[PDB]
Design a protein around this motif. Structure first.
Motif, PDB file in Angstrom:
ATOM      1  N   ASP B 481       0.853  -1.183   0.000  1.00 29.28           N
ATOM      2  CA  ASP B 481       0.000   0.000   0.000  1.00 29.28           C
ATOM      3  C   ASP B 481       0.892   1.237   0.000  1.00 29.28           C
ATOM      4  O   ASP B 481       1.553   1.534   1.002  1.00 29.28           O
ATOM      5  CB  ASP B 481      -0.938  -0.004   1.205  1.00 29.28           C
ATOM      6  CG  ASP B 481      -2.319   0.523   0.870  1.00 29.28           C
ATOM      7  OD1 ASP B 481      -2.581   0.793  -0.320  1.00 29.28           O
ATOM      8  OD2 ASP B 481      -3.143   0.667   1.799  1.00 29.28           O
ATOM      9  N   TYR B 505      -3.638  -3.586  -4.298  1.00 30.60           N
ATOM     10  CA  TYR B 505      -3.919  -2.244  -3.799  1.00 30.60           C
ATOM     11  C   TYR B 505      -3.969  -1.219  -4.923  1.00 30.60           C
ATOM     12  O   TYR B 505      -4.676  -0.212  -4.810  1.00 30.60           O
ATOM     13  CB  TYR B 505      -2.878  -1.841  -2.753  1.00 30.60           C
ATOM     14  CG  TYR B 505      -3.143  -2.417  -1.380  1.00 30.60           C
ATOM     15  CD1 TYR B 505      -4.220  -1.980  -0.619  1.00 30.60           C
ATOM     16  CD2 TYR B 505      -2.316  -3.395  -0.844  1.00 30.60           C
ATOM     17  CE1 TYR B 505      -4.467  -2.502   0.636  1.00 30.60           C
ATOM     18  CE2 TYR B 505      -2.556  -3.923   0.412  1.00 30.60           C
ATOM     19  CZ  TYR B 505      -3.632  -3.473   1.147  1.00 30.60           C
ATOM     20  OH  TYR B 505      -3.874  -3.995   2.397  1.00 30.60           O
ATOM     21  N   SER B 508      -7.555  -0.640  -6.771  1.00 35.39           N
ATOM     22  CA  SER B 508      -8.558   0.205  -6.140  1.00 35.39           C
ATOM     23  C   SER B 508      -8.367   1.660  -6.548  1.00 35.39           C
ATOM     24  O   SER B 508      -7.239   2.136  -6.707  1.00 35.39           O
ATOM     25  CB  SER B 508      -8.485   0.070  -4.619  1.00 35.39           C
ATOM     26  OG  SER B 508      -9.088  -1.137  -4.184  1.00 35.39           O
ATOM     27  N   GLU B 509      -9.480   2.368  -6.715  1.00 32.27           N
ATOM     28  CA  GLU B 509      -9.474   3.766  -7.118  1.00 32.27           C
ATOM     29  C   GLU B 509      -9.953   4.640  -5.966  1.00 32.27           C
ATOM     30  O   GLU B 509     -10.848   4.252  -5.209  1.00 32.27           O
ATOM     31  CB  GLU B 509     -10.362   3.987  -8.346  1.00 32.27           C
ATOM     32  CG  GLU B 509      -9.698   3.630  -9.666  1.00 32.27           C
ATOM     33  CD  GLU B 509      -8.917   4.787 -10.259  1.00 32.27           C
ATOM     34  OE1 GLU B 509      -8.906   5.875  -9.645  1.00 32.27           O
ATOM     35  OE2 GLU B 509      -8.315   4.608 -11.337  1.00 32.27           O
ATOM     36  N   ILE B 511      -7.844   5.829  -3.513  1.00 31.54           N
ATOM     37  CA  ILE B 511      -6.859   5.815  -2.443  1.00 31.54           C
ATOM     38  C   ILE B 511      -5.582   6.490  -2.929  1.00 31.54           C
ATOM     39  O   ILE B 511      -5.311   6.579  -4.129  1.00 31.54           O
ATOM     40  CB  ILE B 511      -6.577   4.382  -1.947  1.00 31.54           C
ATOM     41  CG1 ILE B 511      -6.504   3.411  -3.127  1.00 31.54           C
ATOM     42  CG2 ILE B 511      -7.642   3.943  -0.955  1.00 31.54           C
ATOM     43  CD1 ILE B 511      -5.900   2.072  -2.774  1.00 31.54           C
TER      44      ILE B 511
END
Ligand SMILES: *[C@@H]1O[C@H](CO)[C@@H](O[C@@H]2O[C@H](CO)[C@@H](O[C@@H]3O[C@H](CO)[C@@H](O)[C@H](O)[C@@H]3O)[C@H](O)[C@H]2NC(C)=O)[C@H](O)[C@H]1NC(C)=O
Ligand SMILES: *[C@@H]1O[C@H](CO)[C@@H](O[C@@H]2O[C@H](CO)[C@@H](O[C@@H]3O[C@H](CO)[C@@H](O)[C@H](O)[C@@H]3O)[C@H](O)[C@H]2NC(C)=O)[C@H](O)[C@H]1NC(C)=O
Ligand SMILES: *[C@@H]1O[C@H](CO)[C@@H](O[C@@H]2O[C@H](CO)[C@@H](O)[C@H](O)[C@H]2NC(C)=O)[C@H](O)[C@H]1NC(C)=O
Ligand SMILES: *[C@@H]1O[C@H](CO)[C@@H](O[C@@H]2O[C@H](CO)[C@@H](O)[C@H](O)[C@H]2NC(C)=O)[C@H](O)[C@H]1NC(C)=O
Ligand SMILES: *[C@@H]1O[C@H](CO)[C@@H](O[C@@H]2O[C@H](CO)[C@@H](O)[C@H](O)[C@H]2NC(C)=O)[C@H](O)[C@H]1NC(C)=O
Ligand SMILES: *[C@@H]1O[C@H](CO)[C@@H](O[C@@H]2O[C@H](CO)[C@@H](O)[C@H](O)[C@H]2NC(C)=O)[C@H](O)[C@H]1NC(C)=O
Ligand SMILES: *[C@@H]1O[C@H](CO)[C@@H](O[C@@H]2O[C@H](CO)[C@@H](O)[C@H](O)[C@H]2NC(C)=O)[C@H](O)[C@H]1NC(C)=O
Ligand SMILES: *[C@@H]1O[C@H](CO)[C@@H](O[C@@H]2O[C@H](CO)[C@@H](O)[C@H](O)[C@H]2NC(C)=O)[C@H](O)[C@H]1NC(C)=O
Ligand SMILES: *[C@@H]1O[C@H](CO)[C@@H](O[C@@H]2O[C@H](CO)[C@@H](O)[C@H](O)[C@H]2NC(C)=O)[C@H](O)[C@H]1NC(C)=O
Ligand SMILES: *[C@@H]1O[C@H](CO)[C@@H](O[C@@H]2O[C@H](CO)[C@@H](O)[C@H](O)[C@H]2NC(C)=O)[C@H](O)[C@H]1NC(C)=O
Ligand SMILES: *[C@@H]1O[C@H](CO)[C@@H](O)[C@H](O)[C@H]1NC(C)=O
Ligand SMILES: *[C@@H]1O[C@H](CO)[C@@H](O)[C@H](O)[C@H]1NC(C)=O
Ligand SMILES: *[C@@H]1O[C@H](CO)[C@@H](O)[C@H](O)[C@H]1NC(C)=O
Ligand SMILES: *[C@@H]1O[C@H](CO)[C@@H](O)[C@H](O)[C@H]1NC(C)=O
Ligand SMILES: *[C@@H]1O[C@H](CO)[C@@H](O)[C@H](O)[C@H]1NC(C)=O
Ligand SMILES: *[C@@H]1O[C@H](CO)[C@@H](O)[C@H](O)[C@H]1NC(C)=O
Lengths: 755, 755
Positions: B481, B505, B508-509, B511
Motif C-alpha cells: 500500500d 492495492y 482500487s481507485e 486511495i
C-alpha cells in the motif's frame, strides 16, 4: 398483452400483476400497458424524463421502480410537477440512481416506502418532508461518499423527522453525516446511520427512541489500516466517543452494530438497559485487550450472535489466544467469530469458557495464522455444528443498482457440506500429509473440507481410520496419487467424495490410475472428480453399486475414446445405479460408435456442453431407454436428427444452446409427444416449416427458446409469423433478443410485432 | 553459397565451417553444399534414409549430426552399407532419435564420438564394437525405458568394451541394464550407469578402473513415493546392495552420484580409498537417521559439494533438524543442501557444526516447512554467500532432441540478486508483516528476496531499519500500500527495487498512490514495478536523480493519459538520468500529443510492445534527441513515417515486428545513415521500391528481417528480386520463412531462388 416486451405475472390470490422490464433499453415507456397492473419495473434504461401522462390512465399501480435510470449517461432525470398525484393506490416508490438534486414533490399521501439512494440530495428540510407524513420506510443513503462525491457535508434542519409519526425505517448510510438528526421520531424501529462521519454521540441522541430494534453505527472513526477502499481516519486515531448513559432509553433493541469503529474499551454501562440484545457486532476494532477482560459480556444473557472479527493489534503477534472467563455467561450464544485474532498456538485450555455453551453451534476461528493446534481438543465440542479451520497455517502435529431488500443482514455462505452434520472446514491449511493419529477422537465428524491444502499423498486405505461416521469428504486443489484401488476403503459411511482439481498426478502418463476405487464404497452417492485432466486409466471399468451422480468435466476423454482403442468404451457400464453424467469440456471432436452401448442403463442426465462435437450421431440414442435431460449446448453440431421420435422415446429436455444449425428436418418434431423442453437459441437457423413444428407437439411444450439467432423475416415464413403472435408457448425474449436479419429495411424488426 | 537455406559460419583461425539446418523441414539433403565444410547439422526433418552419395564429394567433414530425425513419423531410418567410409576426416557423429535396431557398420576408424540415444538397440556384441576400437566417447543411453519401451532386458556380452582401449566416456542411462558390463576398460574416465535396473554390485565390478573420475548410480532401487514419473520399486524396498570394499581401486574419483537409491546406511569403508572426492550426491534416499550420525563424513576432507536433499521419512514430522557433529570435518565444503528434511523448528545450536566451515558459501535449507526460525541466528554466517529460506512456512517471531553437451552437470539457477553479495532468499514464506526487530543483526545482507510472501503492509520508512547495507530488495507477488511517500527511505544504499505483482492495492481507485517515493532513494538505479495495473497516482510527477532503468509494463496508462487530462503528461520528465523505459502492454489505443515533450531528455531505450497503438505519430520524435532503441513490436500501426531522417536523428534500432503495414513511403530510408537495426517481419507488406531502400543506407545495416510476411513475387519487384540475391545484408530465414503470395503457381516460392 398485445406488443408488450415485458414479462407479465398474474396472481389471482394476491390480486397483483407484475410487469418486469429489466434490461430492455427502452428509450420511452411502451404503450398498451394494462390498467390492472400493480408492480411496474422501470430499471436501467434510456428514459430522458418522467411525464405526468405516463401514469395518467394507470390508477391501480401500487409499486413503481426507477432504480439506476442514469448511472453517472445523459443529464439528470427531471420530474414534472404533479406527476404522481394521480396514483392514489401507490404504496411503494423507488427512485434510486436518478441523480436527483431535491426530493420530488407531489407524492400521493398513500405512499409508504420511498427510496432516494445514489442521488445528489445533501439537504434535508421539513418543507419537503411535510408531504411525507404518512411514509413508513425512507431510504436516503449513499448520497455523498467516495463513489459519488458531493463536497458538501450533510445538513439536516432541526426536528426534520419529528413530524414523521409513521416512520419506521430510516437509512442514511454513506451520506457524509456528521451529526445525528435530532430528534428522531419515537416510532422508529430500524436506524441505519452507518458509514458516516459522526465523531461524537450525545446523551440525548436516543432519548425518545424506545421501540428501536436495529441500530447501526459503522464507519464512524473506522480502522483504515490495510483498507482496500478510501477512508478518512479520525484525528489522533480517536475512537467513537459514546457516553456510558447512551443506550439507556433503548429497551427493545435486538441488533447493535459497531463494526469498524476503532473502539478500545467497551464499558458494561452500555448494555445495562438493553437486556434483550441478540446480535452484537464489534469487528474491525482495537478490542484485543478488551477480549481478555470482556467485562461487558456479563450483561448479555440473551445474546445470539457475537462478532469480534479482525481485532488484531499493529505489529503484534500474540503467542496464544486470550479468552476471558466471562464468555461462559453467553448462555444463548449460537454463532461466535474470533477471526482476525492472529496468534501462534491454540491450546485446549484456551477454549474452556466455551465448553459450557450448550447453545453454541458455529465457532469461527479462521484467518488467524494458527501454527500449532491439536485436533483432539475438539472432541468436547460434539454439539457444535460448524467449526472453522480456515486458511490459517495449522500443520500436522510433529514428533447497488440491482436487489430490492436494501438494508438486509449478511447471509452466511451455506456450503453443501453443512447440511450433513458436524463440519470441520480445514480448507487452505498448511497440512501436507495425513496421519490417522491426528484425526483421533473425531468419530462424530460428519464433514471434512480439505480444499487448497495441496496434500501430496498416496492413500492406501488407512489415513482416515477414526473417521468412521464421515459422510462427506472434500479433497479439492490437492495432489492425490491413485496408485492403489484401496483408497477410501475405510470410509464405510462416506456418501459424497470430491477429488477435483488433482490434475498434477493425473497429467503424467505411464503411472497407474486405479479408477475402480469406488467399488469398496458401498454407500457412495455422488462422486466429483472434474477438472482432473485424466488421460489414462489402469482400470478398464469403474464399478459402483450405489453411485448416482458422477462429474467428469474438464478431463481428456478423447484419448480414452481414441479411434482403434475400445478398451475404455464401456467405462461407465458397471455403474448400474448411475443416473447423472457430467462429461463436458473434454475436447471430444467426435463420439466413436459403441460408447452409447456401454452407457449405464439407468442414465437420466447426460451433459456434453463445450465439447466441440463436430458430428454427433442420433440413431444410437435408442440404446438409452431412460435418457431425459440430454444436453448438447455450446457444441459444433450441424445436422439435426431426421426423426427425434425414432431416436429417443423418453427425451424431454433436449438443449442445443450456442450451436451452429442452419436448418431443421421436415419431420424434426413428428410424433414427439414426450418432448417437454426444447432449446435452439444462439444458432444460425434460417426458417421453420409447418410440417416440422406441429401444433399438437408445441401445445404441451413448457418452454421454448428461439432468441439471439439469425432468423430472417421474409414472405416464406408467414406461418411462423402468424404462429409466434397467436400461440401460448412461453418464449422468453420474444421481442427483445430475437430479431430479423432482413431483407433490407427489416433489420432489427421484432418477429412478434410483424404484420 | 548460392541457394543454401542454412546459415554458414566461417572461422579462419579454427579452420572450421559450420552449417546449421535446424528446423528446416528438408525432405532431402539440399545440393550445392561446399566441400570445405566441417560441421553439418541435419536435425529433425523428413529425411527418409541415408545414401552413400550424400557425402560422396564431402571429405573435409568432421562433425555430422542426425539428432531426432524421426521421433516416435515414417518407418525407421535405414543406412546403406559403406555410407561413412569415405569420411576419413570424420571425428564426431550423432545418430540420436533414429529408431535404429543395430549399431551402424562401416564407420571410419578416425571417429572419436558416437551417439546412439533414443534408439531401439538393446543388444551389445563385440562384433559391432570391433570397428569402434578408436572411439573415445560412446552414448548408448535412453534405449529402453518408460518413454521408449522395448520389453527386452539389456544384454551385453562378456568383455564387450574390453577391447575399447581408447574409450573415455560411456553412458548407459535408461537402458534397462541389470548387470554392469564387466569388464569395463581401465582407461574409462566417466561412467554413466544411472537410471537403470541394477540391484546388486559386485566387488570386482570396478577392480580395473583406476582413472575413473565421474561415477553415476542413480535410479537403482529408487524412491517411488510421490514420484511424478513411472518407476518400479525394488522388492521389499531393499536398498542398492553395495559392498564395503567396492570403491577401493578408485583413486582419481571426483564426482560420485547416488541420488534416488533408497539407501539407509553409508558405511565409512566406501570413502576410505577415494580421498580426492569433490561432489557427492545422496538425494532422494532414506538417510534421515544417517544424517544424525554422519560417520562417513570423516573420510571426505576435500569434499566440495554435498547433496542430501529430500531424505524425509514417511509419516514422520521431526521436531528439529538433527545435524551430526561430524559435519565440521568438511573443511573444503562450499555448497550444502539439506532440502526435503522437513522439521518444525530451527535453532541456532543446530547449525553449530557448520560454524567452523570457512569455505562454506551456499547453504540450502528450502522446502522444509520450518515453522519457527530466528533470523538473528544467521549473524555468524557472514562469510556465507547464498542462504536459502525458500517456500517453507517460516513466520515472524511472536511475543532431449535439442542440446549437444549430453551428460552435463546441473547448472544452478543464477539469480540476478546473487551477484550483489550476501543473499537471503525469503521467497514464498509465511511472513505476513515486517518488523524491524526481526531483521536485527543482519546489516551485512546485500540482498533480500520476498516474492510470494503476500505481505499486506503500509511501509512508512522504518520496517527495514537494520538493512543499512542492503542494495537489492524484492517485493514481488505482495500487497504493498503506497499510502506514504516515505517508503524505503531508510534504505540509503538500495540500488534495485522490485515492487511488481502488487495489483491488489493499485487496482482500487480513490486511495492515495504516492509514486514520488523514489526521490528519497539517492542511489537507486533500477526500479521494476511492472504488472501492477496502476490506474491512478496521487503524485503528479516522479522524481529520481539517479534512476536509469524503469519498468512499467502491464499497467493502465490509458486512464493516466486520457484525453482532456494533462495532469500526468510529464510523469517521467523529472527522471533526468532515466535511459530505459519499458511501458508496454498498457492498452494504449493512441498516444496523446505532449507525452514526448514530457519524456526524459536522456531517454535511450523506449519500448511500446503489445500496446495496440492504432495511430502513432512520428513528427514528435524530434523531441527525443537520444532515442536509439525505439520498439513498436506487436502493435497496430498502419502508416510509416514520410521521412525517418527528419523524425529522429539518432534512431538505429527501430522494430516493427508483428505489425500490419501494407506499404512503405517512397522516402522511408532517405538520408538515414544513422540507422543500424530495422525490423519489418510479420507484416502485410506488398512491395518495396528502389527509391525507398537505397543501397548506401542498406550497406551499413547490421541486420534486417523481412520474413513471415505477405510479399508478392510479380514482375513489379524485379529490382528487389535482384537485390535480395546480390546483397550482403544479413537476412535470417531468407529461404525458409518468407515466401511469395502469388501470382498463381508462385505460391510458396523462395524469393532468393527466383530468376
Ligand atoms: C471447502 O472450502 C473451499 C474454500 O473455501 C470452498 O471453495 C469455495 O467455495 C465458495 C462457495 O461456492 C466459492 O465462492 C464462489 O466462487 C465463485 C467465484 O470465485 C462464484 O461461484 C461465487 O461468486 C462465489 O464467490 C469459492 O470461490 C471457493 N473457493 C475456491 C478456492 O475454490 C469449498 O466450497 C468448500 N467445500 C465444501 C464441500 O464446503
Ligand atoms: C525471488 O524468488 C522467486 C521465487 O523463486 C523468483 O521467481 C522465480 O524466478 C525464476 C527464475 O527466473 C523463474 O523461473 C523461470 O520461470 C519461467 C517459467 O515459469 C521461465 O522464464 C523459465 O523457464 C524459468 O523456469 C520462476 O518462475 C520464478 N517464480 C515465480 C513464482 O515467479 C525470483 O526471481 C527471485 N528474485 C530474485 C531477485 O532473485
Ligand atoms: C409488488 O409490490 C408490493 C408493494 O406494492 C410488494 O408487497 C410487499 O412485499 C414485501 C415482501 O416482498 C412485504 O414486506 C411488504 O409489506 C409488501 N408491501 C405491501 C404494501 O403490501 C410485492 O412484494 C411486490 N411484488 C413483487 C413480485 O415484487
Ligand atoms: C464530506 O464533507 C466534508 C465537509 O468538510 C468534505 O470536506 C471538504 O471537502 C472539500 C472538497 O474537497 C474541501 O474543499 C473542504 O476543505 C473540505 N472541508 C474540510 C473541513 O476539510 C468532504 O470532502 C466530504 N466528503 C465527500 C466524500 O464528499
Ligand atoms: C489476558 O487479558 C487479561 C485482561 O487484560 C490480562 O489480565 C491483565 O494482565 C495485566 C498484565 O499483567 C495486568 O496488569 C492486569 O491487572 C490484568 N487484568 C486482570 C483483570 O486480571 C491477562 O494477563 C491476559 N493474559 C495473557 C496470557 O496475556
Ligand atoms: C481395479 O483394477 C485393477 C486392474 O486394473 C485390479 O488390480 C488387479 O488385481 C488383481 C487381483 O489382486 C491382480 O491379480 C492383478 O495383477 C491386478 N492388476 C494390476 C494391473 O495391478 C484391482 O484389484 C481392481 N480393484 C478392485 C477394488 O476391484
Ligand atoms: C564442430 O565439431 C567439432 C568436432 O568435430 C567441435 O569441436 C569440439 O569442441 C568441443 C567443445 O565445444 C571440444 O570439447 C571437443 O574436443 C572438440 N572436438 C574436436 C574433435 O576437436 C566443434 O565445437 C564444433 N563446432 C560447433 C560450432 O559446434
Ligand atoms: C525391462 O526389462 C524387463 C526384463 O524382465 C522387462 O520386464 C518384462 O516385461 C515384459 C513386457 O511387459 C513382460 O512380459 C515380462 O514378464 C517382464 N519380465 C519380468 C521378469 O517381469 C521390463 O518390461 C523392461 N522395462 C521396460 C521399460 O522396457
Ligand atoms: C540425532 O541422531 C543421532 C544419531 O542417530 C541420535 O543418537 C542416537 O540416539 C539413539 C536414540 O536415543 C541411541 O540409541 C543411539 O545410541 C544414538 N547414537 C549415538 C551415536 O549416540 C540422536 O539421538 C539424534 N538426536 C535427536 C535429537 O533426535
Ligand atoms: C509526493 O507528492 C505528494 C503530493 O502528491 C506530497 O504530499 C504533499 O506534501 C506537502 C508537503 O508536506 C503537503 O503540504 C501536501 O499537503 C501533500 N499533499 C498531499 C496530497 O498529501 C509529498 O510530500 C511528495 N513526496 C516527496 C518525497 O516529495
Ligand atoms: C492432543 O490431545 C490428545 C488428547 O489429550 C493427546 O493424546 C495428544 O498427545 C495431543 N497431541 C499433541 C501433539 O499434543
Ligand atoms: C497402508 O500404508 C501404511 C503406511 O505405509 C502401512 O502401514 C499399511 O500397512 C498399509 N496398508 C496396507 C493394507 O497395505
Ligand atoms: C437433470 O438435471 C437437470 C439440471 O438442470 C435438473 O433440472 C433435472 O431435474 C435433472 N433430472 C433428473 C431426472 O434428475
Ligand atoms: C533471536 O536471537 C537474538 C540474538 O540472540 C535474541 O535477542 C532474540 O530474542 C531471539 N529471538 C527469539 C524470538 O527467540
Ligand atoms: C512509522 O510507523 C511506525 C509504526 O506505526 C511508527 O512507530 C513510526 O513513528 C512511523 N514513522 C513516522 C516517521 O511516521
Ligand atoms: C536497449 O535495449 C536493448 C534490448 O535488447 C539492448 O540490446 C541495447 O543495448 C540497449 N541500448 C542501450 C543504449 O542501453
Amino acid at each position: 398483452p398485445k406488443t408488450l416486451p415485458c414479462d407479465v405475472t398474474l396472481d389471482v390470490s394476491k390480486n397483483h400483476v407484475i410487469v418486469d422490464c429489466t434490461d430492455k433499453h427502452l428509450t420511452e415507456i411502451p404503450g398498451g400497458i394494462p390498467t390492472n397492473t400493480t408492480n411496474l419495473t422501470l430499471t436501467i434504461n434510456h428514459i430522458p424524463d418522467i411525464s405526468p401522462a405516463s401514469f395518467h390512465r394507470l390508477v391501480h399501480l401500487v409499486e413503481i421502480d426507477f432504480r439506476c435510470n442514469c448511472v453517472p449517461c445523459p443529464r439528470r432525470l427531471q420530474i414534472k410537477p404533479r406527476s404522481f398525484s394521480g396514483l392514489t393506490y401507490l404504496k411503494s416508490l423507488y427512485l434510486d440512481g436518478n441523480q436527483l438534486l431535491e426530493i420530488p414533490q407531489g407524492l400521493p399521501p398513500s405512499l409508504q416506502l420511498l427510496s432516494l439512494e445514489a442521488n445528489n440530495i445533501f439537504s434535508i428540510r421539513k418543507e419537503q418532508l411535510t408531504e411525507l407524513a404518512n411514509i413508513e420506510i425512507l431510504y436516503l443513503g449513499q448520497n455523498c461518499y467516495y463513489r459519488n462525491p458531493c463536497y458538501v457535508s450533510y445538513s439536516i434542519e432541526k426536528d426534520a423527522f419529528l413530524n414523521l409519526t409513521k416512520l419506521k425505517v430510516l437509512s442514511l448510510k454513506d451520506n457524509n453525516v456528521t451529526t445525528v438528526p435530532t430528534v428522531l421520531p419515537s416510532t422508529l424501529t430500524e436506524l441505519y446511520l452507518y458509514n458516516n462521519m459522526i465523531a461524537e454521540i450525545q446523551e440525548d441522541d436516543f432519548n425518545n427512541l424506545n421501540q428501536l430494534q436495529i441500530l447501526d453505527l459503522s464507519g464512524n472513526c473506522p480502522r483504515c489500516y490495510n483498507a482496500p477502499f478510501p477512508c478518512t481516519p479520525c484525528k489522533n486515531n480517536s475512537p467513537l466517543q459514546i457516553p456510558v448513559n447512551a443506550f439507556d432509553a433503548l429497551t427493545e433493541l435486538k441488533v447493535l452494530r459497531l463494526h469498524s469503529n476503532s473502539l478500545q474499551h467497551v464499558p458494561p454501562r452500555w448494555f445495562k438497559n438493553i437486556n434483550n440484545l441478540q446480535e452484537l457486532d464489534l469487528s474491525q476494532n482495537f478490542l484485543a485487550k478488551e477480549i481478555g477482560d470482556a467485562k461487558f459480556l456479563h450483561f448479555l444473557p440473551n445474546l445470539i450472535q457475537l462478532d469480534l472479527s479482525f481485532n488484531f493489534e499493529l505489529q503484534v503477534y500474540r503467542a496464544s489466544m486470550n479468552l476471558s472467563q466471562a464468555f461462559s455467561s453467553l448462555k444463548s450464544l449460537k454463532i461466535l467469530r474470533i477471526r482476525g485474532y492472529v496468534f501462534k498456538e491454540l491450546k485446549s485450555f484456551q477454549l474452556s469458557p466455551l465448553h459450557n455453551l450448550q447453545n453454541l453451534e458455529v465457532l469461527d476461528l479462521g484467518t488467524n495464522f494458527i501454527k500449532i493446534a491439536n485436533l483432539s481438543m475438539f472432541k468436547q465440542f460434539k454439539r457444535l455444528k460448524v467449526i472453522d479451520l480456515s486458511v490459517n497455517k495449522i500443520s500436522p502435529s510433529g514428533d447497488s443498482c440491482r436487489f430490492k431488500n436494501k438494508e438486509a443482514s449478511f447471509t452466511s455462505v451455506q456450503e453443501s457440506c453443512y447440511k450433513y452434520g458436524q463440519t470441520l472446514d480445514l480448507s487452505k491449511n498448511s497440512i501436507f500429509f495425513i496421519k490417522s493419529s491426528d484425526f483421533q477422537h473425531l468419530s462424530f465428524l460428519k464433514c471434512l473440507n480439505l480444499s487448497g491444502n495441496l496434500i501430496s499423498q498416496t492413500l492406501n486405505g488407512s489415513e482416515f481410520q477414526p473417521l468412521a461416521e464421515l459422510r462427506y469428504l472434500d479433497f479439492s486443489n490437492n495432489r492425490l496419487d491413485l496408485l492403489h484401488s484401496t483408497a477410501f476403503e475405510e470410509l464405510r459411511k462416506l456418501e459424497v467424495l470430491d477429488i477435483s482439481s488433482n490434475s498434477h498426478y493425473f497429467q503424467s502418463e505411464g503411472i497407474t490410475h486405479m479408477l475402480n476405487f469406488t467399488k469398496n464404497l458401498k454407500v457412495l452417492q455422488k462422486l466429483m472428480m472434474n477438472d482432473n485432466d485424466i488421460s489414462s486409466s489402469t482400470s478398464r471399468t469403474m464399478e459402483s453399486e450405489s453411485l448416482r451422480t458422477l462429474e467428469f468435466r474438464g478431463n481428456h476423454l478423447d484419448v480414452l475414446w481414441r479411434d482403434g482403442d475400445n478398451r475404455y468404451l464401456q467405462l461407465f457400464k458397471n455403474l448400474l445405479k448411475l443416473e447423472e453424467l457430467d462429461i463436458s469440456k473434454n475436447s471430444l471432436s467426435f463420439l466413436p460408435s459403441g460408447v452409447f452401448d456401454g452407457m449405464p442403463p439407468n442414465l437420466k442426465n447426460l451433459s456434453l456442453a463445450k465439447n466441440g462435437l463436430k458430428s454427433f450421431i442420433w440413431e444410437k440414442l435408442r440404446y438409452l431407454k431412460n435418457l431425459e435431460t440430454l444436453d448438447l449446448s455450446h457444441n459444433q453440431l450441424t445436422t439435426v436428427p431426421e426423426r427425434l421420435s425414432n431416436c429417443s422415446r423418453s427425451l424431454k429436455n433436449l438443449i442445443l444452446k450456442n450451436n451452429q444449425i442452419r436448418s431443421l428436418t421436415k419431420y424434426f418434431l413428428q410424433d414427439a409427444f414426450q418432448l417437454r423442453y426444447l432449446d435452439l437459441s444462439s444458432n444460425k437457423i434460417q426458417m421453420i416449416q409447418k410440417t416440422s413444428f406441429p401444433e399438437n407437439v408445441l401445445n404441451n411444450l413448457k418452454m421454448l427458446l428461439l432468441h439471439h439467432n439469425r432468423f430472417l423475416c421474409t414472405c416464406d415464413a408467414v406461418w411462423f409469423v402468424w404462429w409466434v403472435q397467436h400461440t401460448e408457448v412461453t418464449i422468453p425474449y420474444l421481442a427483445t433478443d430475437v430479431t430479423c436479419v432482413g431483407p433490407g429495411a427489416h433489420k432489427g424488426q421484432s418477429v412478434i410485432s410483424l404484420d
